[PDB]
Every structure is written in C-alpha cells, then in structure tokens.
Amino acid sequence: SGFRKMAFPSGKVEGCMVQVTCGTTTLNGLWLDDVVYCPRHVICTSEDMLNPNYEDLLIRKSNHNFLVQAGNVQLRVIGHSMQNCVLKLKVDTANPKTPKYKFVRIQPGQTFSVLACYNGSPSGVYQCAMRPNFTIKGSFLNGSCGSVGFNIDYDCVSFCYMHHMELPTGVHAGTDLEGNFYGPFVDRQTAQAAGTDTTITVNVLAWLYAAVINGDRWFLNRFTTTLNDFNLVAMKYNYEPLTQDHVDILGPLSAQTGIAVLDMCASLKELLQNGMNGRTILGSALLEDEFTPFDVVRQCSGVTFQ
Amino acid sequence: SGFRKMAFPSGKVEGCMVQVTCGTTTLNGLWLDDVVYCPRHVICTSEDMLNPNYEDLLIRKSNHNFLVQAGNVQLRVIGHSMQNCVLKLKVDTANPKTPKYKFVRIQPGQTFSVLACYNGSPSGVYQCAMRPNFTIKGSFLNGSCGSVGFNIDYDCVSFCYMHHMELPTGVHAGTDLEGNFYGPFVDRQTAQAAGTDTTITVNVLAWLYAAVINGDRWFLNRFTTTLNDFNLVAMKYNYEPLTQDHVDILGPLSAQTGIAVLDMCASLKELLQNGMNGRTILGSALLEDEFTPFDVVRQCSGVTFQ
Ligand SMILES: *[C@](O)(C(=O)N1CCC1)[C@H](CN1CCCCC1=O)NC(=O)[C@@H]1[C@@H]2[C@H](CN1C(=O)[C@@H](NC(=O)C(F)(F)F)C(C)(C)C)C2(C)C
Ligand SMILES: *[C@](O)(C(=O)N1CCC1)[C@H](CN1CCCCC1=O)NC(=O)[C@@H]1[C@@H]2[C@H](CN1C(=O)[C@@H](NC(=O)C(F)(F)F)C(C)(C)C)C2(C)C
Ligand SMILES: [Cl-]
C-alpha cells in the first residue's frame, strides 16, 4: 500500500533529448525519427523576445545556423519549418532510440510527467496537471525550454506538452507538440495573466478513493446526494461542475471500494462546508486535485509500462 | 522558478531491471555486469515466509531453479550465493546496459528515487526520504519487491535501497544492496514495529530556503538565535537536534539567499511555537521534511545528470 505522486519512467524520453543552439540561444529539443522539435524562440536574441517577429527572424536563418547536439555527436540539419510556436528541424540521421510515440492535446484536469532538461540533458522528473486555466505548476529554470510533458501507454509515449514560459504569478505555460499553446498565451516577453483557477472536482474524488483504499476513512458518512445538489454546494467553493461523464470515469474506483460515487460526493460536500476539523487525509491538511482517476487505478492496482 | 518533489531520471536503472522467478514466487532483480541481485525471499513459498530458514531453503535449490528474464531473453544462471538478505545470481551474460554504478548505505534524512517495478517492468518513479526510524513512506504493491532506490551523480548511479516489506503501520522497510536492512527489521512475516518517527530539522530548513527563493517570505523575522537555544525549543516538538555539521551543509543556501542559518532557525522557532496562523508555505499547510539541502540546490540552480 501507500500513495505517492508518481511520474512515468523517463528512459524512453531521455533517449530523445538533444541540445539545440541558434546563435547564442541554447535550449532543448526532442529528436523523433529524423526530426527535432523545439520552441521557435530559439531563433530570438533576448531583446527580440520582448516583441518577436518569428517569420522575419526565420527567413534570415538557414539550415547551418542550427547546431543540434546529441551527446558527442553533432547532427547536420537539412531542413527547417515553423509549425505554430514550434520549430521542426529535419536532420540527416533518424534517432535509433525513437520510441513508439504519438502527439496528443490533453484536456484541463489531465496529468502528465515532465522531464525537466538543461542543455539537452535530463535533470529530473515530476508529475503536473493541466489546470482549468491552462497553466501548470512546474519547476523550470533558464535553459529548461523545450522540456516535454508525456504519458506512457504500455510501450507508447504520448507527448502532450513542450515548455515555453512562466507567467507573472509563477505558473507555467507551453504548447502541444504541434506548437499550439494551451490557453490564450503567446511566446512574447510581455505581461499576460491566466484566468483564475478552479479545483478539479473529479480529481479530488479520485484522491478521496485513494485515501479509502489506503485506510483513511474518517470522512466517510452514511449519506448520499444527487449530482445536482452536490454541484450547487460545490460551485460556491470554486469547484468545477461534476458531470455524468466524470461519474462514469470514477466507476472503477467505485467498484473496487464498494462506495458509490454519490456516497463519496456526500462526504466531499461535508468536507467543503465543515472543514477538515484538525485532521489530515493521506497526510495532507488540504484537498488534493492533481491525481486523475487513472493515476489512482494505475498506482493502487499496479499497472506498468514496458 | 517553482519547487516540486523531483525524482532522478530513471533510464539508467530501467535497463537493469529483470524478472526473477523461483518456483512460483516472482519478483524483481537488478542486473549489473553478470550478476542479478534480488530479495532472498524469492526462494520462499508464502507459507515459508511466516518463519523462513533461508539457508535451508537455498541448499535445496540449484542454478536451474532460478528463471531470470529480461524482456524476451532468458538468462541462464550459472552461480548463486546469499549475502545477508540479498541473493546474488551469477549469469552467463553481462548486462550491456550496465551504467557506471556504486553501492552506498545512506544515512537517516537522505533522499533517493524509487523505481517501482512489477514483473521486472518499471511502473513509476518517486522520491523518498530515509526516516530517522529507518523506514520510508513509499508506494509498493504485491510484486514490487526487488524495486530499488537510487541517486545519480553525473553519470554514476548510487544504489542505496532494495524493497522488501511493509510494516503494520503502512510504512516500508528494505536493505542496502549488500542485503543489510535499514533499522532492526527482519525479512519474516511477523509483527514488527518501527521506532517513533522524528522530523528531519535540516530538511525543514532547506525547504524554508526553497520557499524564500520562490518568493514565499512572510515567515521571515528580524531575529537571530543560538544553535543551543533553537535545539532546546525544537526538541519538544520532536524535531531532531540540529548539529554544526547540518549548519555547514546549509551554508550554500544561506549564501545564495543572504539569510544566515541562525536567522532561518529563528523563523522556524516561531513557526513551531505559534503555528502557521492560517497561512501556507510553497502551497503546503504543513512543514515539509523530505527535501535535503542538496535536493534544493539541485532543483533551484539546475544540476543535470548526463
Ligand atoms: C526559455 O526561453 C529557456 O529556457 N531558454 C531560452 C534559452 C533557454 C525560458 C524558460 N524559463 C526561464 C525563466 C524562468 C522560467 C522559464 O520558463 N522561457 C522564457 O524565458 C520565456 C521566453 C521569453 C520570456 N519568457 C518568460 O518565461 C518570461 N515570462 C513572461 O514574459 C510572461 F509571459 F510570463 F509574462 C519571464 C519569466 C522570463 C519574465 C519567451 C516568452 C519567448
Ligand atoms: C514482496 O514479497 C513482493 O513484492 N513479492 C513476493 C512475491 C512478490 C512484498 C511486497 N509488498 C506486497 C504487500 C504489500 C507491501 C509490500 O511491500 N513483500 C512482502 O509481502 C513481505 C515479505 C513477507 C511479508 N511481507 C510483508 O511486507 C508483510 N509485512 C509484515 O509481515 C511486517 F513486517 F510488516 F509485519 C505484509 C505487508 C505482507 C503483512 C516478507 C517480510 C518476507
Ligand atoms: Cl498540506
């Protein structure tokens, strides 16, 4: 037993990271097949980044302006194009360590692993959720741009995030691997604000199930509720609405524990109204909303990723 | 910026995990060079595990009783010996993916990454601390025995933990890679108790520095204290004594932030006496003691692990 914030194993992604340099800007790229993908602001000086014209910077560049390194090997670039906010560099060598992979655009409330990299080299791995306001709460220093977010599905890496920037509040914003931002952000160094955040209700319920599985059961009550009556109460605490889709997704936890979803909702309703009454759940004094139902099943049933 | 519980990248370890089977007991092993290391209770039936005689079980086994698989390949075992609570299996094939490595015995208060595995296959990665009572708070289901804990130092994996069991309180116990337990536990299915835990003071101070680096500064006060006077107060809250060694180790954080260690101790003293006054630090309502000073520098300066 036990419950921990767990990242996917990172090996399959570690063998795809390279260092991309253009002029004196250096960041990370992801080498899959004969293509390297990286943030397009690799073509900016830091002054350009205050107000960039990427198309105009890119025309002035040729293949030879891009230095791509994988450990000791330089990779000769033989083509380039821009897709939204991502730069695609065609190279003369396919990556032999390319895993089976897909590009995916994730939904608010879904989690992924981040492999934080500096100079093409992996530094660490952690879990993030895509917030309802389309930001993530990560850990990224200078050089971390181009670090990617991902999920593993057996042998297949789904890439879902590439890191670009940090907002004035300290949270993080990036793109899918087709270079489309999550949320209304642009790759320019100017003040921009995220929407106010909300709590991912389905994820709090999945954590309450994890808690029960792990023996923490003091918050369980004898009541049920209706979806409608739960959403009316929760709304005021800035919880996002729970839909019937979410109820269906929680069904496996429900069946594993023998506690109906609307029985758990009745427990959560009382926690929001009354507080935690000087008690913890899974060691935490606050409700946690960054585990998906899948994360809980994965961890509290034992699913692995060849 | 940002601060997250971060694991080392797991690739170097992922290529060392194999599945070991003996009879109808299956668990994980670590394949380095031509040796596989695994928990010795792989030779037990579940009935044996209630009260095992490992030496007597092992004499009855020969090399051919051990089935070791790496993905599709079976590895023929050509020798076996027991070292404390670990079983060493000599195999006919050296692991070509063996990283530079060392075996290390860690101290209470030190952190490591755990690669949780099932059937030789990696499931996930997380950070743990070795508690002062020599347990860890992990996440381990049936099949997870033989999962290892580790640190990376540039290119070198230091292996420090191999998972064996879970205690009646839900916390976890294991051995170093020479098969010596951390703490007074034995590999037998019988009631055993950990010492009462204590809080790792140096780690709470390193987290307070992380917090300051990340802009959370409300708990900073204008006072200093003496090491002696801090330890007198903290003792009563079941904080472990802060030594001059610990002060020296915190020096880098101190210099990065310009806040003397005994200035921070004066802040921590007031937090213990007065409480957190309905405020959080780095998002947490409780003090966190599972980041080492090194973890903080690593994450809030950007160190990577080729
Ligand atoms: C990223 O550019 C990078 O790693 N490198 C460029 C060469 C190496 C860098 C990553 N990073 C470092 C600063 C702390 C957090 C972080 O994500 N990203 C950036 O510096 C982007 C980049 C410029 C400005 N920028 C920002 O993140 C900035 N934010 C903003 O201006 C705002 F949107 F949030 F308001 C600063 C945090 C630097 C102020 C691009 C947006 C193109
Ligand atoms: C480990 O044996 C394993 O993964 N496998 C055996 C074949 C696959 C297993 C891992 N595990 C599964 C149960 C939940 C937590 C956990 O660590 N470890 C064990 O089952 C050990 C093993 C027996 C008994 N054991 C225990 O962990 C037990 N604990 C105790 O008896 C006590 F020390 F804590 F009191 C139980 C949790 C199973 C009660 C060995 C000690 C040899
Ligand atoms: Cl908390």
XYZ file of C-alpha atoms and ligand atoms in Angstrom:
697
model
C 0.000 0.000 0.000
C 0.858 3.708 0.130
C 0.083 6.592 -2.198
C 2.635 8.872 -3.797
C 2.774 11.367 -6.602
C 4.393 9.151 -9.225
C 5.966 10.043 -12.611
C 6.180 7.643 -15.558
C 9.687 6.129 -16.011
C 11.598 8.538 -18.237
C 14.074 6.307 -20.173
C 12.150 6.299 -23.474
C 12.099 10.098 -23.454
C 15.662 10.502 -22.149
C 16.966 8.998 -25.402
C 15.084 11.676 -27.451
C 16.520 14.807 -25.824
C 19.096 16.899 -27.696
C 20.544 20.381 -27.313
C 19.585 22.923 -29.989
C 21.606 26.124 -30.458
C 20.922 29.046 -32.800
C 23.382 31.931 -32.461
C 23.874 32.170 -28.703
C 20.412 30.887 -27.687
C 20.520 27.286 -26.483
C 17.586 25.148 -25.443
C 16.263 21.601 -25.555
C 14.813 19.672 -28.482
C 13.038 16.365 -28.894
C 14.515 14.124 -31.582
C 11.940 11.658 -33.054
C 12.704 9.890 -36.347
C 14.675 12.411 -38.465
C 13.019 15.498 -36.937
C 13.965 17.675 -33.996
C 11.163 19.721 -32.398
C 11.956 22.758 -30.206
C 10.445 26.129 -29.134
C 10.629 28.632 -32.000
C 12.078 31.361 -29.734
C 15.409 29.516 -30.095
C 15.860 31.953 -33.043
C 15.469 35.044 -30.820
C 18.053 37.090 -29.028
C 16.740 38.041 -25.580
C 15.986 41.507 -26.968
C 13.927 40.033 -29.844
C 11.874 38.112 -27.250
C 10.351 41.395 -25.931
C 8.389 41.643 -29.198
C 9.422 38.989 -31.794
C 8.630 38.576 -35.495
C 9.392 34.866 -35.848
C 8.740 34.674 -39.589
C 11.129 37.539 -40.166
C 13.803 36.015 -37.874
C 13.457 32.618 -39.548
C 13.877 33.772 -43.190
C 17.280 35.155 -42.188
C 18.324 31.701 -40.918
C 19.500 28.741 -42.969
C 19.971 25.071 -42.007
C 23.577 25.738 -40.992
C 22.621 28.313 -38.345
C 21.150 25.477 -36.211
C 23.616 23.438 -34.153
C 21.939 20.259 -32.846
C 23.952 18.055 -30.490
C 23.228 14.613 -29.094
C 25.934 13.891 -26.533
C 29.165 13.789 -28.530
C 27.520 13.753 -31.971
C 26.569 16.818 -33.973
C 23.555 16.249 -36.223
C 23.571 18.064 -39.533
C 20.289 19.938 -40.107
C 18.995 19.529 -43.676
C 15.639 21.343 -43.484
C 13.540 23.627 -41.292
C 9.975 24.813 -40.951
C 7.847 26.504 -38.313
C 4.552 24.959 -37.116
C 2.716 27.472 -34.928
C 5.098 28.085 -31.982
C 7.331 25.054 -32.670
C 10.301 24.700 -34.962
C 10.827 21.498 -36.923
C 14.392 20.727 -37.958
C 14.909 17.908 -40.434
C 18.177 16.114 -39.737
C 20.384 13.699 -41.691
C 20.101 10.982 -39.017
C 16.998 9.276 -37.683
C 17.057 8.729 -33.903
C 17.607 4.935 -33.426
C 16.240 5.313 -29.876
C 12.902 6.746 -31.138
C 10.143 5.008 -29.057
C 6.697 4.234 -30.420
C 5.046 7.617 -29.936
C 2.036 9.875 -30.592
C 1.303 13.596 -30.261
C -1.764 14.340 -28.140
C -3.512 17.522 -26.971
C -4.611 16.975 -23.344
C -7.700 18.312 -21.621
C -7.789 20.521 -18.476
C -7.626 18.221 -15.430
C -5.375 15.592 -17.074
C -1.936 14.822 -15.660
C 1.427 14.096 -17.292
C 5.114 13.600 -16.419
C 7.629 16.341 -17.089
C 11.233 15.523 -17.888
C 12.958 18.786 -16.920
C 16.121 19.185 -19.085
C 19.020 21.658 -19.335
C 21.362 21.667 -22.365
C 19.699 18.582 -23.760
C 20.461 16.695 -20.537
C 17.757 15.302 -18.167
C 17.778 16.808 -14.680
C 14.662 15.292 -13.068
C 11.101 14.050 -13.498
C 7.811 15.056 -11.843
C 4.021 14.973 -12.328
C 1.933 18.028 -13.348
C -1.775 18.581 -14.036
C -3.086 20.845 -16.795
C -5.042 23.397 -14.747
C -8.554 24.539 -15.794
C -6.919 27.901 -16.629
C -4.481 26.063 -18.989
C -1.344 26.584 -16.843
C 0.787 24.039 -14.988
C 2.580 24.337 -11.691
C 6.039 23.078 -12.598
C 9.680 23.792 -11.831
C 11.622 25.363 -14.694
C 14.810 27.454 -14.706
C 16.691 29.125 -17.538
C 17.628 26.510 -20.128
C 14.533 24.370 -19.412
C 12.585 25.492 -22.520
C 11.927 22.554 -24.833
C 11.477 20.143 -21.909
C 8.485 17.935 -22.691
C 5.489 16.511 -20.910
C 4.261 12.982 -21.584
C 2.221 9.933 -20.691
C 3.163 6.317 -21.376
C 0.659 3.738 -22.567
C 2.346 0.341 -22.389
C 5.179 0.919 -24.883
C 3.900 4.142 -26.489
C 4.874 7.631 -25.335
C 2.100 10.198 -25.806
C 3.787 13.638 -25.934
C 1.418 16.381 -24.756
C 3.455 19.415 -23.583
C 6.508 21.420 -24.513
C 7.672 24.096 -22.090
C 7.914 27.737 -23.244
C 7.496 30.261 -20.414
C 6.441 31.362 -16.942
C 3.632 33.804 -16.130
C 3.820 36.732 -13.617
C 2.217 34.594 -10.928
C 4.990 31.901 -11.108
C 2.949 29.270 -13.027
C 3.977 27.784 -16.380
C 2.669 27.791 -19.952
C 3.531 25.792 -23.042
C 2.312 24.181 -26.276
C 1.280 20.798 -27.577
C 3.864 19.248 -29.949
C 2.128 20.908 -32.937
C 3.133 24.249 -31.415
C -0.356 25.330 -30.298
C -0.387 26.943 -26.848
C -2.602 25.705 -24.083
C -4.704 28.718 -23.107
C -4.572 32.293 -24.533
C -0.812 32.848 -24.119
C 1.766 33.973 -26.686
C 5.526 33.392 -26.823
C 6.429 37.019 -26.118
C 8.061 38.579 -23.041
C 5.153 40.840 -22.008
C 2.721 40.837 -19.064
C -0.005 38.258 -19.527
C -2.450 36.824 -16.985
C -4.020 33.368 -16.513
C -7.742 33.049 -15.777
C -8.461 32.455 -12.096
C -8.001 28.780 -11.339
C -10.674 26.289 -10.204
C -10.407 22.974 -8.369
C -10.637 19.753 -10.411
C -13.529 18.050 -8.606
C -13.267 14.629 -10.271
C -9.604 14.538 -9.207
C -10.445 15.347 -5.562
C -12.934 12.470 -5.569
C -10.358 10.100 -7.066
C -7.950 11.144 -4.235
C -10.660 10.505 -1.605
C -10.947 6.961 -3.079
C -7.150 6.515 -2.869
C -7.430 7.542 0.740
C -10.109 4.934 1.494
C -8.069 2.253 -0.290
C -5.136 3.262 1.956
C -7.239 3.010 5.152
C -8.020 6.749 5.754
C -11.810 6.550 6.246
C -12.825 9.056 8.972
C -14.530 11.396 6.424
C -16.929 8.714 5.168
C -20.571 9.404 6.091
C -23.853 7.444 5.827
C -25.443 9.945 3.367
C -25.929 10.035 -0.414
C -26.576 13.075 -2.624
C -27.750 13.970 -6.108
C -25.320 15.209 -8.727
C -27.395 18.356 -8.923
C -27.333 19.067 -5.215
C -23.605 18.381 -4.986
C -22.817 20.805 -7.837
C -24.938 23.557 -6.217
C -22.946 23.379 -2.978
C -19.533 22.853 -4.603
C -19.939 25.715 -7.093
C -19.567 28.250 -4.302
C -16.172 26.824 -3.218
C -14.872 27.301 -6.793
C -15.020 23.579 -7.549
C -15.658 22.818 -11.220
C -19.014 21.110 -12.022
C -19.075 17.341 -11.786
C -20.630 15.865 -14.948
C -22.124 12.431 -15.586
C -19.040 11.754 -17.724
C -16.859 12.269 -14.643
C -19.156 9.990 -12.619
C -18.715 7.275 -15.260
C -14.922 7.678 -15.198
C -14.908 7.212 -11.384
C -16.898 3.949 -11.718
C -13.805 1.628 -11.451
C -12.756 3.185 -8.130
C -16.348 2.951 -7.004
C -16.462 -0.810 -7.799
C -13.040 -1.518 -6.282
C -14.055 0.122 -2.914
C -17.816 -0.589 -2.916
C -18.544 3.130 -2.288
C -20.919 4.734 -4.794
C -19.759 7.950 -6.440
C -22.683 9.896 -4.927
C -21.864 8.489 -1.460
C -18.344 9.928 -1.860
C -19.813 13.244 -3.172
C -21.816 13.465 0.064
C -18.557 13.093 2.008
C -16.852 15.803 -0.083
C -19.847 18.109 0.369
C -19.467 17.900 4.182
C -15.686 18.476 3.967
C -16.239 21.715 1.992
C -18.956 23.023 4.323
C -17.418 21.997 7.651
C -13.670 21.912 7.025
C -11.235 19.140 7.904
C -11.695 19.668 11.669
C -7.963 19.478 12.507
C -7.493 16.162 10.633
C -5.491 15.064 7.604
C -6.209 12.836 4.611
C -3.265 10.768 3.244
C -1.034 13.001 5.381
C -2.369 16.216 3.752
C -4.165 19.054 5.537
C -5.526 20.285 2.145
C -7.627 18.517 -0.514
C -5.506 17.390 -3.468
C -6.752 17.782 -7.053
C -3.777 16.658 -9.160
C -4.468 12.897 -9.309
C -6.706 11.660 -12.124
C -8.875 8.569 -11.596
C -6.491 6.768 -13.954
C -3.492 7.833 -11.809
C -5.191 6.280 -8.789
C -6.030 2.963 -10.515
C -2.525 2.843 -12.056
C -0.933 3.285 -8.621
C -3.469 1.301 -6.477
C -3.658 -1.765 -8.811
C -0.071 -1.878 -10.197
C -0.020 -1.075 -13.972
C 3.447 -0.997 -15.643
C 4.880 0.389 -18.893
C 7.240 -1.980 -20.740
C 11.079 29.154 -10.737
C 8.810 26.705 -8.904
C 9.528 23.873 -6.495
C 8.444 20.281 -6.941
C 9.278 16.918 -5.491
C 11.540 15.668 -8.272
C 12.906 12.152 -8.980
C 16.150 11.465 -10.849
C 15.581 10.355 -14.488
C 15.201 6.579 -14.394
C 16.559 5.386 -17.798
C 19.918 4.114 -16.495
C 18.111 1.973 -13.928
C 15.290 0.908 -16.265
C 17.827 -1.019 -18.362
C 18.949 -3.018 -15.254
C 15.573 -4.416 -14.179
C 14.771 -8.093 -14.778
C 12.149 -10.526 -13.526
C 13.374 -13.306 -11.220
C 11.254 -16.419 -10.614
C 11.922 -19.327 -8.249
C 9.147 -21.930 -8.150
C 6.003 -19.801 -8.215
C 7.468 -16.735 -6.449
C 8.241 -13.921 -8.880
C 9.852 -10.601 -8.077
C 12.245 -8.009 -9.455
C 16.023 -8.159 -9.770
C 18.735 -5.689 -10.664
C 21.123 -6.899 -13.359
C 24.595 -5.234 -13.137
C 27.540 -6.777 -15.008
C 26.998 -10.575 -14.880
C 25.153 -10.536 -11.533
C 21.481 -10.279 -10.677
C 20.614 -9.049 -7.166
C 17.160 -9.710 -5.652
C 15.453 -10.207 -2.241
C 16.308 -13.638 -0.823
C 12.640 -14.386 0.000
C 12.243 -15.160 -3.724
C 13.067 -18.736 -2.550
C 10.113 -18.841 -0.117
C 6.600 -20.056 -0.613
C 4.185 -17.678 1.130
C 3.913 -20.230 3.946
C 7.719 -20.315 4.390
C 7.658 -16.506 4.741
C 5.814 -16.782 8.111
C 9.042 -18.161 9.613
C 11.766 -18.861 6.978
C 15.090 -20.709 7.153
C 16.772 -19.181 4.103
C 19.954 -21.250 4.318
C 17.905 -24.418 4.423
C 15.682 -23.296 1.502
C 18.714 -22.298 -0.564
C 20.682 -25.584 -0.248
C 17.692 -27.337 -1.826
C 17.911 -25.009 -4.855
C 20.308 -25.240 -7.779
C 21.126 -22.720 -10.537
C 18.374 -24.151 -12.742
C 15.615 -23.408 -10.214
C 16.064 -19.659 -10.925
C 14.358 -18.299 -14.041
C 15.682 -14.805 -14.857
C 14.044 -12.936 -17.735
C 14.985 -9.687 -19.433
C 12.163 -8.862 -21.833
C 12.199 -11.677 -24.385
C 15.546 -13.160 -23.314
C 16.015 -15.796 -20.642
C 19.365 -15.526 -18.859
C 20.957 -18.778 -17.789
C 22.015 -18.665 -14.117
C 25.472 -20.188 -13.561
C 26.022 -19.496 -9.845
C 24.272 -18.343 -6.677
C 25.109 -17.093 -3.217
C 23.323 -15.289 -0.405
C 24.700 -12.033 1.068
C 22.722 -11.140 4.193
C 19.126 -10.669 2.937
C 20.050 -10.456 -0.771
C 20.547 -13.198 -3.307
C 23.294 -12.919 -5.905
C 22.777 -14.869 -9.115
C 25.730 -15.148 -11.470
C 24.548 -15.218 -15.074
C 26.133 -16.188 -18.401
C 25.570 -12.716 -19.896
C 26.833 -9.367 -18.668
C 24.250 -6.566 -18.932
C 25.451 -4.336 -21.849
C 23.260 -1.537 -20.444
C 25.067 -1.603 -17.050
C 25.630 2.097 -16.071
C 28.617 3.281 -14.069
C 27.406 2.452 -10.569
C 28.216 2.159 -6.847
C 26.531 0.597 -3.811
C 26.020 3.047 -0.950
C 24.441 2.837 2.515
C 22.510 6.089 3.109
C 22.023 7.946 6.367
C 18.664 8.816 8.023
C 17.417 12.083 6.487
C 18.852 11.420 2.997
C 16.567 11.159 -0.026
C 16.568 8.882 -3.077
C 14.441 7.985 -6.123
C 12.461 4.767 -6.198
C 11.773 2.981 -9.459
C 8.690 0.931 -8.537
C 8.643 -2.251 -10.712
C 6.300 -5.220 -11.236
C 7.466 -8.361 -13.091
C 10.753 -6.726 -13.957
C 8.898 -3.863 -15.659
C 9.054 -0.196 -14.480
C 5.725 1.252 -13.360
C 6.697 4.683 -11.986
C 9.265 6.811 -10.174
C 9.081 8.908 -6.990
C 11.243 10.444 -4.238
C 11.514 9.012 -0.687
C 13.485 10.008 2.418
C 15.070 7.501 4.797
C 13.233 8.336 8.031
C 15.100 8.663 11.369
C 13.355 5.398 12.357
C 14.860 3.716 9.226
C 11.553 3.346 7.316
C 10.396 5.021 4.105
C 6.963 6.188 3.093
C 6.633 4.654 -0.358
C 4.028 3.014 -2.568
C 4.508 -0.720 -3.079
C 2.037 -3.450 -4.064
C 2.475 -7.192 -4.462
C 5.219 -7.865 -6.999
C 7.147 -4.682 -6.090
C 9.832 -6.463 -4.009
C 13.267 -6.003 -5.562
C 12.448 -2.460 -6.720
C 15.477 -0.285 -5.989
C 16.222 3.149 -4.635
C 18.983 5.310 -6.095
C 20.722 8.627 -6.570
C 22.522 9.794 -9.704
C 25.807 11.677 -9.600
C 26.513 12.936 -13.111
C 26.780 9.591 -14.934
C 27.031 7.286 -11.896
C 24.050 5.589 -10.256
C 24.464 5.129 -6.498
C 22.131 2.266 -5.470
C 21.044 2.610 -1.834
C 17.773 0.677 -1.289
C 16.089 -2.550 -2.266
C 12.463 -3.028 -1.259
C 11.471 -5.999 0.939
C 8.349 -5.363 3.039
C 5.726 -3.179 4.689
C 5.259 -2.696 8.440
C 1.899 -2.792 10.344
C 1.662 0.989 10.218
C 1.794 1.088 6.352
C 5.430 2.294 6.049
C 8.162 0.424 4.166
C 11.428 -1.333 5.010
C 14.286 -2.655 2.920
C 18.034 -3.301 2.633
C 21.100 -1.735 1.101
C 22.407 -3.660 -1.947
C 24.648 -5.771 0.337
C 21.450 -7.153 1.870
C 21.723 -5.362 5.233
C 18.394 -3.976 6.461
C 17.954 -0.367 7.393
C 16.765 -0.441 11.003
C 16.057 -3.502 13.229
C 13.736 -5.342 10.812
C 13.914 -8.927 9.541
C 12.546 -10.482 6.347
C 9.867 -12.523 8.114
C 6.070 -12.150 8.054
C 5.571 -11.369 11.765
C 4.508 -8.245 13.688
C 7.352 -5.772 13.985
C 7.280 -2.090 14.951
C 9.308 0.955 13.839
C 10.643 3.407 16.429
C 8.517 6.541 16.710
C 9.495 8.932 13.950
C 11.082 12.392 14.327
C 11.174 15.387 11.991
C 14.343 15.984 9.942
C 15.155 19.544 11.032
C 17.909 20.272 8.497
C 15.458 19.281 5.747
C 12.745 21.646 7.051
C 15.281 24.480 6.991
C 16.333 23.612 3.437
C 12.605 23.746 2.445
C 12.209 27.157 4.139
C 15.135 28.345 1.938
C 13.427 26.926 -1.181
C 10.376 28.873 -0.151
C 12.306 32.151 0.139
C 13.969 31.525 -3.234
C 10.449 31.041 -4.663
C 9.164 34.317 -3.142
C 7.292 32.948 -0.048
C 8.782 35.200 2.664
C 6.025 36.063 5.191
C 7.598 33.840 7.922
C 10.930 35.688 7.878
C 11.606 37.648 11.087
C 14.265 40.165 12.219
C 15.642 37.853 14.974
C 18.643 35.517 15.253
C 19.138 32.613 17.674
C 21.853 30.342 19.012
C 22.084 26.727 17.926
C 21.690 25.784 21.560
C 18.558 27.814 22.127
C 16.982 26.578 18.901
C 17.583 22.915 19.819
C 16.046 23.429 23.292
C 12.790 24.735 21.813
C 12.667 22.323 18.857
C 13.344 19.220 20.969
C 9.879 19.447 22.486
C 8.175 19.363 19.048
C 10.007 16.089 18.260
C 12.418 17.791 15.864
C 15.815 16.088 15.693
C 18.789 18.138 17.028
C 20.442 20.484 14.573
C 24.227 19.969 14.630
C 27.039 22.227 13.434
C 27.522 19.718 10.602
C 23.966 20.431 9.437
C 24.613 24.183 9.710
C 27.675 23.771 7.474
C 25.673 21.768 4.917
C 23.046 24.568 4.741
C 25.780 27.167 4.040
C 25.252 27.197 0.201
C 21.546 28.013 0.581
C 22.488 30.614 3.146
C 24.930 32.295 0.697
C 22.547 32.075 -2.267
C 19.725 33.862 -0.290
C 21.814 36.065 2.039
C 19.907 34.699 5.081
C 22.112 33.247 7.823
C 21.263 29.753 9.037
C 20.565 31.041 12.569
C 18.272 33.765 11.154
C 16.247 30.990 9.473
C 16.323 28.919 12.725
C 14.736 31.903 14.488
C 11.949 31.852 11.885
C 11.421 28.093 12.338
C 11.374 28.503 16.123
C 8.456 30.979 15.846
C 6.582 28.699 13.403
C 6.764 25.792 15.895
C 5.665 27.892 18.880
C 2.959 29.960 17.177
C 1.725 27.801 14.303
C 1.263 28.811 10.677
C -1.583 31.234 11.515
C -3.851 30.118 8.638
C -1.088 30.547 6.009
C 0.764 28.203 3.671
C 4.393 27.832 2.609
C 5.033 26.700 -1.013
C 1.335 25.776 -1.109
C 1.633 23.487 1.964
C -0.219 23.906 5.260
C 2.354 21.594 6.964
C 6.158 21.842 7.252
C 7.912 19.507 4.809
C 10.976 17.493 5.862
C 11.701 15.313 2.816
C 13.931 17.700 0.823
C 17.660 17.605 1.560
C 19.752 20.765 1.140
C 21.262 19.089 -1.926
C 17.761 18.473 -3.370
C 17.042 22.185 -3.023
C 20.303 23.339 -4.670
C 19.879 20.707 -7.422
C 16.369 21.979 -8.183
C 16.897 25.755 -7.532
C 20.190 26.050 -9.521
C 19.610 23.478 -12.322
C 22.016 20.481 -11.970
C 21.613 17.667 -14.566
C 22.707 14.025 -14.835
C 24.119 13.026 -18.241
C 13.181 29.572 -22.046
O 13.318 30.613 -23.024
C 14.559 28.941 -21.867
O 14.691 28.004 -21.112
N 15.580 29.416 -22.569
C 15.741 30.483 -23.565
C 17.176 29.982 -23.789
C 16.974 28.974 -22.638
C 12.700 30.178 -20.709
C 12.475 29.183 -19.561
N 12.281 29.856 -18.267
C 13.419 30.652 -17.735
C 12.898 31.755 -16.867
C 12.148 31.219 -15.764
C 11.023 30.321 -16.229
C 11.124 29.722 -17.614
O 10.160 29.166 -18.146
N 11.474 30.908 -21.021
C 11.447 32.240 -21.101
O 12.363 32.918 -20.649
C 10.231 32.848 -21.784
C 10.565 33.278 -23.208
C 10.520 34.778 -23.273
C 10.079 35.300 -21.930
N 9.805 34.080 -21.143
C 9.256 34.039 -19.935
O 9.035 32.985 -19.374
C 9.046 35.375 -19.233
N 7.621 35.468 -18.959
C 6.866 36.436 -19.446
O 7.236 37.402 -20.082
C 5.382 36.283 -19.143
F 4.694 35.719 -20.129
F 5.180 35.423 -18.182
F 4.932 37.442 -18.665
C 9.932 35.576 -17.979
C 9.644 34.574 -16.851
C 11.393 35.436 -18.425
C 9.685 37.003 -17.465
C 9.521 33.962 -24.056
C 8.084 34.115 -23.618
C 9.671 33.822 -25.563
C 7.253 -8.771 -1.720
O 7.420 -10.084 -1.166
C 6.780 -8.949 -3.160
O 6.604 -7.973 -3.853
N 6.602 -10.176 -3.632
C 6.759 -11.527 -3.080
C 6.499 -12.075 -4.491
C 6.217 -10.635 -4.968
C 6.190 -7.999 -0.907
C 5.915 -6.557 -1.357
N 4.718 -5.989 -0.716
C 3.412 -6.635 -1.013
C 2.480 -6.440 0.141
C 2.263 -5.041 0.386
C 3.562 -4.298 0.609
C 4.833 -4.924 0.082
O 5.943 -4.499 0.410
N 6.643 -8.038 0.481
C 6.079 -8.843 1.384
O 4.992 -9.368 1.170
C 6.863 -9.065 2.670
C 7.563 -10.419 2.652
C 6.916 -11.301 3.682
C 5.871 -10.495 4.410
N 5.995 -9.141 3.831
C 5.369 -8.050 4.260
O 5.557 -6.968 3.744
C 4.305 -8.250 5.332
N 4.718 -7.439 6.467
C 4.970 -7.958 7.655
O 4.809 -9.112 7.997
C 5.507 -6.959 8.671
F 6.830 -6.963 8.771
F 5.295 -5.730 8.285
F 4.806 -7.091 9.796
C 2.862 -7.954 4.853
C 2.634 -6.491 4.444
C 2.582 -8.869 3.654
C 1.912 -8.311 6.006
C 8.354 -10.877 3.854
C 8.622 -9.986 5.043
C 9.474 -11.871 3.591
Cl -0.600 20.059 3.182
